[PDB]
Amino acid sequence: GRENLYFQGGLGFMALDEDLRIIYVNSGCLRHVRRSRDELLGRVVTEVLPETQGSYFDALCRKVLATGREQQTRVDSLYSPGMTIEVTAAADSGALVVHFRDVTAE
Numbered sequence: 401g402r403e404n405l406y407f408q409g410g411l412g413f414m415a416l417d418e419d420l421r422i423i424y425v426n427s428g429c430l431r432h433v434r435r436s437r438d439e440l441l442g443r444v445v446t447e448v449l450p451e452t453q454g455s456y457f458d459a460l461c462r463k464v465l466a467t468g469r470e471q472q473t474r475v476d477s478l479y480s481p482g483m484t485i486e487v488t489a490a491a492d493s494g495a496l497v498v499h500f501r502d503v504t505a506e
């Protein structure tokens with residue numbers, strides 16, 4: 401189960417640059433947060449998705465930036481409470497790439 405920016409496996413993906421600006425988002429990610437691409441692209445993630453600040457996701461991204469290592473966690477979703485998700489964050493070519501998978505039926 402090793403989805404990445406190229407082989408997304410139908411999962412929601414977002415990529416952030418070194419200023420944590422949203423430089424890539426797919427449709428599944430947009431539907432999850434219930435936003436349009438124009439609202440998020442090029443914006444600093446904490447500005448347009450402020451619910452992520454101080455959350456597990458904040459810690460997850462910080463750990464990737466501080467160690468370079470991939471991080472994965474299983475948590476209740478911020479944007480869809482009651483949905484159990486597995487969230488992965490990793491560096492891929494200078495970008496910080498995040499994806500999530502609904503694991504509610506597991």
Ligand SMILES: C[C@H](CC(=O)O)OP(=O)(O)O
Binds near residue numbers: 414449480498499500
């Ligand atoms: C925080 C979110 C997953 C969640 O709903 O907890 O991930 P994205 O910011 O949409 O990549």
